[PDB]
Structures are given as C-alpha cells and as structure tokens.
Design a protein around this nucleic acid. Sequence first.
DNA 1: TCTCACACT
DNA 2: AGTGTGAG
Length: 426
Amino acid sequence: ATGQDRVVALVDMDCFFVQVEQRQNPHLRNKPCAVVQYKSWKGGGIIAVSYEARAFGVTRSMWADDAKKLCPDLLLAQVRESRGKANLTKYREASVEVMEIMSRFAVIERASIDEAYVDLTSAVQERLQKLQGQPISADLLPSTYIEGLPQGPTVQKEGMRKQGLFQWLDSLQIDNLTSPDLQLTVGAVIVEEMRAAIERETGFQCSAGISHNKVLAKLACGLNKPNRQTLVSHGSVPQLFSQMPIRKIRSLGGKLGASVIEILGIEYMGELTQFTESQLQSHFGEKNGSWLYAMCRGIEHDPVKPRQLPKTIGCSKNFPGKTALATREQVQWWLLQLAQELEERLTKDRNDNDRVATQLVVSIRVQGDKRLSSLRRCCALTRYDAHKMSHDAFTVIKNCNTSGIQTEWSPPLTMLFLCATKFSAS
DNA sequence: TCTCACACT
DNA sequence: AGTGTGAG
Ligand SMILES: O=c1[nH]c(=O)n([C@H]2C[C@H](O)[C@@H](COP(=O)(O)OP(=O)(O)OP(=O)(O)O)O2)cc1F
Ligand SMILES: [Ca+2]
C-alpha cells in the first residue's frame, strides 16, 4: 500500500491579510508593505508581510519600527481595533469569500483563516471520464511546477518550470485511468481552475500544493511561492525527503521533531526510513512511531475533513509587562470587552450557520507563570448576552485572586481569554 | 506579536 | 474537565 489512493491539495492565500488591505487600498499594491496591530508599542507588531517587503528581510513577529529599519519605504496597514483590542473581522469575511468559491470545486477542510485542504479524489475521477482519453496540454497547467523536474541530459525560472512540465506530460500514460500520476495531474488542472476562479472573483492570489495527502500537499505548497502551485508525486518523495529537514514536515516543527532529531541522530526526513516501525514506536509512542514510519515513505492517511467552519469561537487579549491587570474592576471591564466582541461574533454565527454554542471557556494567565495558559475553566453558555457571559467568566475565576483585598488582584493577570465551544444545530 | 485544532490524561 | 503541543 503506497499511499496513492487520494488526491489532496493545500491552498494558501499568499500574505493574506496584506492582500486584503491591498485590494481595498490600491495605493498599497505591488509595494513592500505589512499589516500591523497596536501602533503604540514599537510601531506595532507585524502579522503579515508582502513578498516585496520579505525581500528586504521583513518577517512576521517583527516590530514595525524594526521592519522600517530593514525596509525604509515599507507601507503599513493597521488592523481594526474594537473595544481596545485587535479585531480580525474583515479578514474572516474575506476568508469566507474564498472558501465559498473553493467549495464549488471539491470538499474543503478549513485549516486556518488563510488555508484550506481540498480533497479532489472524486472531482478527478469525473474529469478523467469526460476527458475521453485525450492528452493534457501544457496550456492547462500555466502556473504548475513538477517537483524534481526537469532532470537529466535554461537560465530563467519560467524556462525551468516549462521544461519540467514538458518532461512530466511527455511521459504521462494517459491510457491508464488509474495511474496515480495521471490523477495528480488532473488534480493540478482542477486547482489551476480553482485558483483562477478565486483570483477572478476576489482578486486574491494564492499558492497551492497538490499531492496524495495533507502533509505532502502542505509541504508542496511552500516550494514555489507566490502565486504558483506545485505537484509532488509519490515518486518524487525519496529525493525530496533526502535533504528535507525534519522540522519542515507538518507537526514536526516543535518538541517532537527536536526529539526525533536528537534521539535518532538524524537531520533529514528520509533518514527516518532506516528504522523499523517498532523502533520508532519505542522512542515516540505507538501513534507517533506508526505515523513517522509511514510519513518518511510519503504515506499519511489523515482525512480531509469536510469542515468549512471553525469549531470554537474565541476572544483573547494579552496584558504584558506593567499593563497586567491588578484591580478587580479592571478584570471585570476587560472580560466585558471580550464578552461583547464574542456576543457580536456569536450572533452572526447563529444567523449565518444555524448553530448555537453551549459552553463558555475562560482562561487567564498570571504574571510569573511560564505557559500560554495558566488555568482553564468552563461553564454553561445559555444566552448570547455579553454581561452574563462576563459575569459568569468572572465567577469561575474570582477564586484565583490570591490577594486578600477585595478590590485588588494578585498576582496580576497577563492574559484574558473567552472561548465559545460545544456547538449544536440551531 | 490573536487565534484555532487536537492528543493525552 | 483540564493541560500541553503545534500551527497559522
Ligand atoms: O503568527 C501569525 N500571526 C497572524 O496574524 N497570522 C494571520 C495573518 C496572515 O495573513 C495569515 C497568514 O498565516 P500564514 O502563516 O499562512 O502566512 P501568510 O501571511 O498568509 O503568507 P505565506 O503563506 O507565507 O505566503 O494569518 C498568521 C501567523 F502565523
Ligand atoms: Ca497564507
């Protein structure tokens, strides 16, 4: 079993937030520019960077003042602030523009505000039968790269792409409606169409990866960016993985990937193939070891889940440094701010998508603790009312106040989080 | 520099 | 139910 059953794509909207601001403000298009939140602290934190700006070294998580040192003509759009906090509504609404188009072509799993996986297996099958048995023209794939091609016995990027595509298509056995390579190729044609539709109907450009599973689709998408798509076939996997750092594969970018590297003494994904499955399991657990054994051979079975809507709706703000909440009524006022945005977003959700959430998650962080969350508590969510929700959130966290004073809050709070969960049909 | 999904327990 | 990981 070679992990070639499915055709799966990952589509990534290139520097999406920037694109959203560039569509709305044409003065920004085709310039180095970035999206920031909170202008006051060091010019604001950069959450999205156009490709022109990235060429100067500007990255996400940079302060805008720092990015301006690297890129003096950098243009900035600020995120909308509402009730003292960054509000992402405009981007969420652009994201829904895009997913609704993608869903006309295939079933899509929303992976984040700017990317979606796409299961094209069924769509490919139908296109294959309408195609009589007729060859696939290079003209159907005007922005597609075939990973690992050209090879064997031109100095410009587009010349390379074409030569690789020619070599791919010249050897395609179109007379076999079950070759996985043919299916990928038809998958790629559909994604060219889907990306043409997204750009025509929204003005947004994006990159896509096309392969046999989600991890490879995602890896492929990042290989030829921006506004390009890449086909990673099963056959390309041994050479692709032979120099591919372990941390580049989805879910190995963190502690597990680090311990795979250290315990095993390897650097690249393909070095995993010399270990038995039992060996991998003993070091990393039954699930992880099984997952690694198959993955380093290009095989992964995680399904594209037919889910175009988030499972949770969440509202958080950080209060770092001297800005940590120290008084009771301060903590109340911000919970109320969080509860109010949440109500706004919950009501739109109940009306657009026919469902109500039923559980409220409250999470806080205390100054001096180490981790994203210090403590997580839940309670019932019965009415979309901001005042009750914030009253309830306070109720389930007021005992964390180690201060004996009634009006003070120690240790001061460095993060407040309200999340609606456990949706049911409405 | 605010999100969202999921595995373990 | 609560914590921790991984990612955008
Ligand atoms: O830390 C983050 N903060 C943060 O707001 N977002 C938001 C803002 C951003 O446009 C969007 C994109 O996430 P991506 O990691 O996929 O990167 P892009 O900007 O779209 O460009 P590309 O995929 O490299 O071409 O999510 C992602 C984060 F990772
Ligand atoms: Ca993106």
